[model samples]
Structure formats: C-alpha cells, structure tokens
Target chain A: MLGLKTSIIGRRVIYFQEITSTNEFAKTSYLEEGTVIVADKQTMGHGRLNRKWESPEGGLWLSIVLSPKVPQKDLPKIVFLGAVGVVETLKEFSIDGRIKWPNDVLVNYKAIAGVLVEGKGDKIVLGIGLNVNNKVPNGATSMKLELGSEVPLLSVFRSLITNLDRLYLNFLKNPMDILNLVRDNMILGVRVKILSFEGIAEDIDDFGRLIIRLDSGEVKKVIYGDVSL
Target chain B: MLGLKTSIIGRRVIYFQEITSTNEFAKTSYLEEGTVIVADKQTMGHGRLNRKWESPEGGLWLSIVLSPKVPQKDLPKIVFLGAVGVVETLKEFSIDGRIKWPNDVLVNYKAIAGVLVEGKGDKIVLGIGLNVNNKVPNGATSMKLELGSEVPLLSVFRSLITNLDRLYLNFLKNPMDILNLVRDNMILGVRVKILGDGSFEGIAEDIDDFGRLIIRLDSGEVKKVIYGDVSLRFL
Candidate 1:
C-alpha cells in the first residue's frame, strides 16, 4: 500500500506474509521495473556472494525488479546503488551507514543492511535485507538494537523504496552516477586482504570491482571476494 | 599523443589550434560519450555560471561530450565530478588541490582549474580548464608556476584522462558517488558569505544531494544555496 511519489519504483507492491526469499521469488518470475516484492518474514533470506541472511519478522526484507537500459557491463553497479540507497535511508533515521565495497552496508565496521542484486536476463532483482527490529548475528546489529528500540517497518520500506526509486530513475537517466558517492560512502584507503592478494584498498573499478594496490605497486581488481581490513 | 589504460572517456581526441570554447564546440556538435574536444588556445573561455576564463596555449582546455543518464536536477553533480577529477589529477603530481564547491579547483586557495557543465537537450558538454604551463592572474597559480618548470602538457592531460576515466567509469555504476570526496576536498565548516539576494552568511555546513550548499546561519535557520559566488573567511 505504498502510494509513493516516485517515477517507477514501488508502484505495484506484491506482499508476502511469509516467503523463502524475496530475491529468490523475484528472480524466478518476470516483473516490470519497480515491481516490488516484499516479505514480512523470510524463511531463507540471503545476501550477495552466497550467504544466508537471518530474515525474520521486525526486518524490512524486500526486492524490486528492474529492466534498466544500462549495458551489461554496468549493471553490477545496480547493487552499489542498492547499498547507497540503504545508507541514505538509514541517514534519515540518524544512522551513519557506510558501504563495504560491492554490497554490504555497515556501521562502525558492523553489519546493518545487505544488498543483493541478481538478474534473470535483462530483468534485475535488487534485494535488500535491513535489520529494523529484526535479530542479526552476534557480530551484527539492527536499527532497533542500535536505536534502543524498533521503528515502523513499513516506514523504513517506504523510505527505502523512495531512495532506490530516486537512484534508479536517476541512474537510467544518468547511468554513470553515484559510484563516486558509493566510492565515497564505501570505506576505503585501508589495509586489506582479499583471497590471496593483500594490499591497501584503493578504489572501485568501472565493473564495480575493488581495486587493491599491493605493496609492490601492482594493482589487482577483485571481482567478488570478502575483504578483510 | 594520447596513451591510456582506461576503457573509455579518452578513447577519442579532437584537437584545435584555436577555438571559441571547447564547451561551445561540444555543445553544438553531436558526439558520443567520452569524446574529448581539446584546444591549444581559445579566443573566449568561460567558467560555470558564465565568467571569462583566460584560455591560452599552455593550459589543459578540454571538454567532454557526455550523455549522462541522470535527470536535469542531478546534472550539477557532473561539475563536481570534474572538480574531483582535477583534484585527483593534481594529486598525481604531488600538488595538493582542493575544490571550491560546485566547480572551481584550487591549490593553496589559488585558482587552478574551472569545471563548466553546459548541457544541450539530453547531452552535456562538460568542460574542465586547468592551468598547466599557462600564465595566470595574480590570484591564480599554474603547474608550471608552482613547480618552477614547464613539463609535458599531455603528461598532465594523460593523467587527467586516466583519473577522470577511473572516476567516471566508477560513476557508471552509481550516482552522486563523489560527494564524500568532494566534501572532503572542499572548504567547509567555516563561515562564508554567498553573493546573492539573501547574500547570506553562515557556517558552510554540507553539500546537499543536488550539490547545493547547506548552511546554518547565526539565526539557527538552515538554508540551501543553489549556486553563487561565495566569500570564505579563514579561522
């Protein structure tokens, strides 16, 4: 029931009282751009790079379908757009959110929100699992946990939808935008180790890859890997 | 004379011995994204909001024809990206550069470059004028003047291309991605008097989403100044 003031995103919301995963559902089916599929609870929620997200009630677990005009090489940025969308939504609630490379949203080096972007051909399923009043792992925290209490879950979704819509429409019109913001909001310039390569986290490449400059001045671009800083 | 390791943004080059303005040319002509138009000298050059920028032979007078997918409201950010591009390009030469909100690039509070974004229809002609070996006015400085020697202009041009390509390609992923770095490199927290109708003065707080200046006045009134010449006071 989100009568949002957006160009395309969040216009038609398909609600689920319980589901396996919004992303899983959105990916398996065909939906128009900005067709939102949300779940009050997810049985098997997941994040980027193959990790099960603990999705239960009190969290905003949602996904939006998109058919962007962007080239295939630039579609991966859709995930960072999702990440910055979370950060911006969190900023409204006084949460200082930061992006971790490609997808995860963090606060104080702790996890807060997860961005997962999947595609079935040209249809992109952009998923977000935000811990509003939900429970996270021992290392992670939620808005309820951080703010001392939980706020409205739908309110968070509305804001998230607005942000993603703003970023999404802007991205379609201005396809090459916000990576500097994502790069800015992303925590960089630190020593890190990803897979076998160890170096300083320098920049994010065009393909949404993390550029790590080793001590030997060799620059390596990580397509997808968990970075340890 | 353009050798780079980037995917695009400098793949094509159109040079001129003399012109009115690279931005003007880019605006009038039909060009693809990242097609660069450069000039050795310009009879007339300008900055954002339209002010004559003395363009001569020894400067990096270049304009990029870009078809950004962003709406018109978000296009002001393109100028800021050009500013950061110049700042990063300056960093490669060990010259610490700072951005003066919106477009002007500075080194030690001395003007070094100007970014002008003038769009036509759905296309944008983004111009960046950085002083290299060129002589400047009293309040400005050039790379040659700062380094006490003139160096190869394309070396700086190549670096500018590389850095801009890196940033813009990264931008191809998201929108408004450089605000953090723009704010980091910009003059903030200090009091500045924006030259306009309100002509207001306040603590230059933050740069808003559309690149407007967020200010908190002594009256505790919060305001966002769209674009104007500003006067900054040092602490």
Candidate 2:
C-alpha cells in the first residue's frame, strides 16, 4: 500500500492513445522534469540490445522523468532502485517476483516487466512497460497468470513509483547501499560463461561495464557485444 | 554533382510530416541502424543541456543512426565528429563557420548548429538540427545570403554526410587522429569556461571524462573559458 498523497508521480501525466515508444515520446516532449507519459498501447516498443518488446494492449507502458543530481557514472545503481520498486509492486499480486540481471523483473524464470533508462537534458527518465491483467505473450509472463488473480495494473505501478521513490531517496542518502544490492542480485556467478567479443572477460571489475553472462563461456558487456542467452 | 548510391544510410530512411521532435520520431519508429529520419520541420527540436532548438520552416532538421563500435565511455567523441561535419558543410558558402566548444557550431559568433547523441541499442543516433537555408527568424543566415548566391540545401547536406562518413571511417581506423583534429580545432583549448550548478568554471582540462572538460576549478581540470560573441556578423 503506497501512502503517497498524489495520484500523479510528480506533476502532469500524459496518456497517449497509441504511440510507437514511450521513451521516444518522453525524450523529445516539452514535458517538464517530473512529467510522466503513459500510453494505453504502444505500436512500437523497445527492449535492450535492440530487441522488440511487444506492447499490444493490457500492458502498462509508462515513462517517468526525474531530475536528480547523481553522476552519470553511477547510473547502473539507479537500475537497482527501479528493480527493488518493481519487486515490491509485484509482491502485492503475490507473483513472487525477483530482479534479473540488469533490470528485468522475472517470475518463474519468465520476464514479467522491464525498465529502460534515458536522459533528457539533465533529467533522467525511467521507462517501464509491464504485462499486468493480460495474457502472457510468447516468452513473457503476466501477473494474473503467475498469481491466479488479475491485478489492477495502475495500482501495481503506483506502488512501484512509491517504492522507487523510497529507494531513490535512499540512494540520495547513502549511494553505496545500491551497489551492495546490485552485488547481491548478480545472476552471473561462477557457473556462467560470459559471451563477450573477445570471449569472456575475467574478474569483477569487468562488471563495471555491466557484462551480462550468456550460455556459452563468453561474457558480454554493454558498449561492446550483445549477450546471447 | 553527388554520387552516393544509397539513401538508406543503414537500411531505411523515414520521412515524417511535422513530428513533435524528429529525434523522438526516429527513436520511436524503431528505425533500423544507420536510418536517417528527416523532417521539413519539428515543433519541438532539442539542444544540448536541454535548451530549446529553434526549428522554423525552411530549415534542415534530421537525425542519423550510427552503430559505432566505440565504447559508451567514448561516446563524446561523436560530438566533435558532428561539429566538424556541420562546420565544414557551411564553410563553402564563404560563411566563416567555427566550432564553439563541445558540439555547437557557430557562424559570425552565433550558434547555428547543435548536436545531440543518444545510444539506441547497439547504435548511437546523432541528431543534427541546423539553421540552414531558412531565413533567420531573428536575423539568421541562408547559404545564398552568406555567399551572395543561391545554395542548394541538399547539396550542402550531401557534402556534410560524406565528410561524416569519412570521419567515421577514420574514427574506426584510429580514434587518436579524430582526437587530434578536435585538439587542432582548438575549440576546447583553455580559453572557454563551463557553466555549472551556480558559478562559472574557468578553463578546465580539454579532454577528461570521455570528451567532457572539467572547466571549473574543482577536482576536475580547470581550463580557460571561451565566450561566444553572439553580436558579431559579417556584412
């Protein structure tokens, strides 16, 4: 239960009938720093590494903008704040969700929700599109399918923003704690082979680049090679 | 006479009619890598530091998709690449175009072009919106006016993209040369200051944090500050 007073995340909220991408909308829109853009259906949605994220309907496609004074180098830490919030939000539906590497909220080894980060000017916007109260698409999961009861998608996202606020505040207070959370939730451990261009990069410092380990004995970090799982 | 076989820079080039922002449209359309999104105009064009870029009629507003295999840490290098292309494109018109530190291209000491770079999946789309061919809403320049003759906007851009391709190629060959061009340009030389939180940061290091200079006297390099003389014009 989020006890926040405001229904809006920051100030104004724009709901689109149909848009290609929420992140794309937020990036170029005249919306202020705290504006939230939501679309009922996304004709074109994006996932990390140029993957096509299906957004037909009954899915929550939203983007939130925040003006924080965090350094760009510490961006990955913000991913954890988003994951913690999403995990808490999914908890209400009793779906038993946990964070996957990077920023996917998974249930029963299937991705239920994902987060995308983009920067505008000096503002940072987090784009979240989750499947709730809808049938799980191929290679995807839904709240109802996992917890046996359809969940109010907006209610779940409201809690998510509230939880995100808390963690973000915590991040603003003690930035180091976010790193600890990332370390604890690291999915790639000893048994993983990273799919990197030059093969698997050894050592933990390599993770500073957010290397995602794949099925093969190869590690893949952002900015270099895409990880194939 | 131009001689490029493909309009599809990567795979496709999408044309839009009055989009909120060309950058937003390209990113949303999920254009393929090297896709170029061009528009006659943009209602809300953007600039560095979130400033509003004026995009009235008779102007060129476009975004190009690039899959440069450079590290994200090295993303700032594209800024110089963008500046050089824009500046060189305008120089043929006898317009004295020079790069204002970072990514803004200036003519007669007025900002004429700006660069905005974003990572789209495995590629980086460098969005360029310039005040070209368009009559200066507030006294701007058209290549015709600058050169005392008519200049085809497309021809200027074709040359621009050609140079962009070459610089991009050289960048892949050896990024150090590109860095040298940026240095030789002396746009970031210790003569410019950076505006920050509350005060002015004096001449900081030219190259730090990828390509961002620490102009303030903070822990970062403190270099000189260059001021843009917005009042100058070549009559």
Candidate 3:
C-alpha cells in the first residue's frame, strides 16, 4: 500500500509483481485516466530513446495515466509538472532538487531521478523512476544514500502523489507559475552540448522549449533534444 | 493490386475490405515501416478532433506507417509532404491543386483531399484520404467530378505513391526544399481566426520552419499558431 492521500493521482493503484515497463504496460492496459501502475521490479524498464533503466527492488518505478485536455503541441509540459512534483516531494526530506532541463532530477550534479512522458492515443503515460532505497548506477544518487539512512517508500510515495495532484490542479489554472518554478531550478546560462550541437543554455520559453544560443551566435529553439552538461 | 511504382512507400500494401480506420488499424497492427494499409471502405473514419470523415467507396483511404529518423517536433512536416504528394499526383490530370495551409488540398477553393498524421510509439502513421472517384460531401470536390470522367484508380494510386516516395527521400536529404514546396502552394495573405484562449483574429502571414502559422494580429503582434483548427475569415 502506498499510503497515498491524493484525490486524483495515485488514488486507483494497480500493483504488479514484475512487468516489462510501467509506461509500456500503462499504454496497453485499459485503466482509468488517473490510474497509477506500480511494479515491484521491472525486467525491461527504459527511459527516453529506449535506453535501459535499472529497476531494482528498492526503487520507485511507476507510471501514471493522464488524459489532460491539452493539445499535442503542449504535451511536453506534462514532464515539467512531474519534475516539479518530484522536486517538491524531495523538499520534504530537506534535499535540494534541481531539474536538468527536460525531465531529469538532479542533486549536487548527480541524477537521482528521471521522467519519461509518452503519448498513446488520448492517454499520456508519465513514468517516473526515482532512486528511493536502492543503489543507483554510477553518476546517480539515491535518497537513502543522500540522507545516509534508509527512508520509507510509503512516505515518499504519499508526498509525491500529493504534490503531483496539487501541481496538476494548479497547472490547469495558471501554467505559467509551474513553468516559472521549473525554470527557476533549471541549469541555465551554462555551456552545454545537445547532440552534435554545442551551445550555451540561454532560457526556456513558455511552451517548455529550451532556447540554446549556438557557438555561431544564432539562437535555436530546441523542442526535443538531450542536453548534456 | 495497386499500380504503385514506388521504392519504399506502399511497396508492401495490405488491402482491406472494410476497417474501422486506417490510422487506428496502423497504430495497433505490427507492420513494416513503409507498409501501406489500404482499405476499400472505412466504416468509422474520423479526422482531427474526432470530426467525422466520409470514407465512401471509390476513394483512396490509406495510411502509411513511417519510422522517420527525425525528432517529434518535426513530424508534422510529414503531413505537409503528403499534401504535396497529393497535389503532384493531381498534376497528371492537369488539375491545379493548391494547399490550404497545413493539410488540406484544395482545387479552386474546394477541398479535394485531406491528410491526418498521428504518432504512436516509435512509428508515425500518415493517413491520407483523397476524393478520387467518389461523390464527396458538400463543399468538397473529387478528381472524377472535376475531370468530367472516371479516372483510373490504379494510375492515381501509382502516381501518388511514386511522388510520396520521392518527396520522402528528398525530405531526408533536404527538408527545406519540401517545406518550401508546401509553402509555395499555401494560401497566404488571408484573414484567419485561431482558437486558443479565445478566437484570435489575424492575417495569415507565413509559416515558420517548423510549420507553425505566423498570424499577424491587428496590434502588429505575431502569434504563432501550433495546433488547432484555423478558421478562414472572409475579409
């Protein structure tokens, strides 16, 4: 049981012993819009670009189905909402969470979590993989490792769902507030490489697009790309 | 069998007597990347925003599955490519096919064809419905209706597939050429209204590289219209 107190998100939970990927499973399953798919372990968990994501026993690997009334052009902003929710949940534990441009959650220059937003028909499955109480790979950190002690998964899950529900409700009213919050924690004004193009992270627009000024003094708006620091 | 002479597009065709929707069938079915799903009739065809699309017999209702090596933001350009392909095929009959902004192909201000692009998983399905030899609804025109005779369906299908294959190949080599071709046939310098926070009235200025509609409003402000139906206002 996830000890969740949210009204919309995580209210209807489906637990699985082992699955291929929560996001993939959520897409095929006929669940409610707000249903959350939680798996104890994922044999084939993956991230953006289908990269293999390690899903050990003690990690928080889950996917939530959201059917928001928004156009496909603005769907990428859902990933930002997930990042802000995770950052807010981490603040409950006195940890400073910074968003890595698109959907990565970092603490002290190490990735502690990652978000994957996929669209399937009218449903959007937002998957979050957080290192709760497990050992992460190199260049990753966990909450237990950061706090120097093991933390309760139920506590983290409850706080996460609560913040996610609140943020989503606020997103419907004023998306600019949530977008500004995401921009506030972003690593902007720094030299970064996105694929073969290297540029300085200038700023992010209202549509959740990253504006990168290339080395040739031309600014480019990147809708979807992997940013490397 | 379709007389398709393409190297990639429609190389492997799956003919169906009747289906729910070609786009719907393409999304769930595991077909090859360039495989084309052609249906003799569509019982439940729908357009963007679930608008009912009359897919009667004698029309070309097909969907092509494509796994393009491009980002998602630029995927909408595939719809533009399809419009250009349809227009090129119409050229064989000496019909002047012009584009209505993003996806609608028109002949003398009447819609003759429409394209719908949907993405699922790693595959993007480009569905095109052309009024070849059928009686279209009001405000719509057909090739047979315009030519005053029933044109050969096989010839039109082959020409469309060939042009689509060539355009897609050029799209990979130089996308700007295809974008410019789409722009050349577009109906620009017209008043239109885009539905957003409210109905924002503006004049159709130009299309950006990403295919966004740049609408110049009354206040001399340019608003980029991304997704949503644009209503043309008679100015």
Candidate 4:
C-alpha cells in the first residue's frame, strides 16, 4: 500500500517493487478516482508507438486514475495536462524544463520525462514516466545526468502528485491557465518534421495540435504523430 | 454463445440468468472488443448514475464491450448507437419508437428502453436495458405491453444485436447518418430542465453534430451541453 497526503490526486496509491507496466495494470483494473499505481521498476515498461520504455529502479514509473467531470471535447485536455504537471513539478527541483509538442518534457534539448494517456468513459489513467537518478536509454538524459547529482525519488513523487492536483484543480476553474502554460512553455521555432512534413515549427493550436510551416511552402496541421526534432 | 454475421460487434457472448448489472460487471472485469454480456435481470440496474431502473424477470439488460478505433470525441457515439439499435429493432417488431435526447427510447411518448454508458482505456461498456416482457415501470412500457402480446426474447436479441452491429459498422464508416437520425427522432421542441453541474430550464432546440444537447435557455441563450441530464419535461 502506498500512502500520500495530496489534496486530490492520490485516493489510493498502490506501490510495487516491480511490475510489467503501470499503464497496463491501471488500464485493465477497475481503479477508483485518484487511485495511483507506482512501480519501482517496470520489466516491460511500455511507451508510445509501442516502444518499450526503460524503467530502471531509480526512475519514477507511475499512473494516476482520474474522472474529471468535463465535456467529451475537454476530455483530451487531461492528457495534455499530464505534461503540464511534469513541467511544473520539475521547477521544485530547480530544473528548468520545456515541453515538446504533444507531451514530452525536455531539459536542455534532452528528454527527461514523457507522458501517456489511456482511458475510457469518464475514467482515465495518466502514465507519467520521469527520469530521476536513473539510467535511461542511450540518448535520453535523466535529472541526475542533467543536474550533476542524484535527487530523492520520494520527494520527486510527492512534489509531482501535489503539483498534479493543484494544476488539475486549476484547470477545472481556469482552463486557459493550463493552456497558456503549455503553449508558452513548448519548444518551438526549430526544425522538426511531423510524419513526413519537415519544416519550421510554428505554434500549437487552441486544441493542442502541432502547426508546422512546411518546406513545400505550405502550412500543415499535425494532429499527432512521431516527430524528429 | 451467440451467433451473428456482422463483424466486430460480438466477438464473445456471455449469458446470465441474473446479475447485478452488465455495466458494473463489465467495469470490474476485463472483456474483449465486441464482447457481449447479457443478463436476464439486473439486481442493481441503473442509468447514468444513482438513477435506478426496474430490472425484473424478463427484460434485456445487456452490455457490449467495444474497443472503437475513433478519436476521443467520437467515443460518445457508441452510447448513441445503443439507442439506435433499440429504436430500429423496435421497428422490426412494428413498434414505431422514437429517441429521447442523450439515449432513451420512447415508444408512443413513453420510455420503452434506455442506455447507460461507461468507457475507459481503449474500451467502452455500452449498457442497454430494453423492456421486453417485464412489467411497467410507470412512465416506461415493455415490448409485450406495447405490442399487447408476447415476443420471443431470442428474436428480439438477434434483431437488436444485428442492428447494433450494422449501425456500429456504419458509425465507423460515416457517423452523420447516425447523428441525423438521432437528431430528427429525439424528444425536442419542448421546455426541459437540464440538471447536473448546474441547473436551468431551457427549450430543447437541437442535437449538435458532436451529439451534444443544444438548449435555448429561458434567459435568451443557447448553450450546447456536453454532459447533463434533461429532467422535468413540460408540455
């Protein structure tokens, strides 16, 4: 049993020393609102595009269940909010981070964290994978690698859940606040190709889509896809 | 075991004499896409949340598991298909039924069937309760009660599920037909009270292209409602 004192994001925290994937467990299980599934390491950690995420022991591999009472159109926003929480929480450690389009957090152009959203109906499980004092895949960097020292995993987890609740509640009242934070903090104005269209990255639309000014002199709207930046 | 020709609507079928509710059961359990869970009666039947339904001996209390490959916005259409299947199947039995906004089937202005939806992960449990041969629940009527005679539950099940299969395929192909039919046949043009998150009395104006309820409020405003209940109807 995992215990925490967050205002609204951890109804029941289930901690595990090892698991295949927190997202897989949370998706299949019937979890209550704010129920969190955290793992010390994932032997088969999952990722977007069906890639296996590297989940070493010192990393933070967790998933939080949510059932925000919002419109179906507004439902997609929660997934975007996952990055907002991570970006904001990193500030507690004095780490300056920026968000990549969709929801990847980067520090000095090296990925330090990522997010995955999977849910049905009013329920959702936001899987947040953060690199904190752990070894990652070859290219990506961790907090310790970036900060030159190891950080406490327990402190990071607490700060993350607490910031998530504050940001979530803030989103319920002021949706624009969340949107503005995400839009302003995104890494843009660089060369990025989204699904075959290579161009200068422009802006994020109102609905969080990636807008690209293409090399073919055409502006393209990218809903979502793998991008090479 | 149930047999059907349509693809991707009933990958597996489980029948029960009685259970709490197919939605509850499906929520707590893992089910494959297009899997069907049917119960003769629901011990704790409900629609939406906290609203009880009478699920006695003879009624179709069923839920279908679907892993629709649609955007998150289009997911709600699966629940709308529940109403479409029920309404169309009623026509096969020669009962001209209509739909109430948000997924309630009305036969001659009385509710004969209803739908409750729950979705999570890449799956959705679409729960439907059609009054087949059960006794009346006051403002609600059964198929037998409406037809003034009994009908085979097997025949009803086949027709309903078949309709759902085709409609779901069509929904995956083109959702407008489903949206147009639902908008045209729903209970509208009357004063209705919209409840949940807030309350207000408004004229039921239109169902949006996204399946949201457009209410022309008494304050001379029209608000498109995405999640709310229409209560206390006025003539």
lDDT of 2 at B161: 67
Q: iRMS value of model 4?
A: 18.0
- In the predicted model 3, the residue pairs found to clash are none
Q: Which predicted model would earn the best lDDT?
A: 3
Report the C-alpha lDDT of model 1 over B126-223, residue by residue, as the tens digit: 89999998888888999888788986786888788888888787665666787777988897888877775546778988898667888898999998
For all the candidates, what are their Cα RMSDs to the real structure?
Answer: 22.5, 21.3, 24.1, 22.2
Q: Is the docking of candidate 2 incorrect, acceptable, medium or high quality?
A: incorrect
Q: On residues A78-104, what C-alpha lDDT tens digit does candidate 2 reach at each position?
A: 656666667777776665775565677
Per-residue lDDT of candidate 3, residues B1-235 (tens digit): 1223466776556555466898998888887777777776789998888898899878888898888876666777888999999999998888889887778899988999999988854798999999988889998999998999988775677788788989988786676677788888888888877765568888888889878888999999988877555544435
Interface RMSD of 2: 18.3
Q: Which stretches of candidate 4 lie over 4 Å from their true place?
A: A1-229, B228-234
Pick by lDDT: 1 or 2, better one: 1
DockQ, all models: 0.01, 0.01, 0.01, 0.01
Q: What is the DockQ of candidate 3?
A: 0.01
Docking class of 1: incorrect
Error of 2 at A131 (Å): 51
Query: Tens digits of per-residue lDDT for model 3 on A1-229?
Result: 1124565776556545456998998999776767777666789999988999999877888898898886566677999988988999899998999998899999998999999999898698989999988779998999998999988775787688788888877776676777799888888889999867989998899888899998889998888878899
Query: Worst lDDT window (10 residues) for model 4 chain B?
Result: B1-10
Name model 2 segments beyond 4 Å from true: A1-229, B1-3, B6-11, B137-142, B186-191, B201-209, B214-235
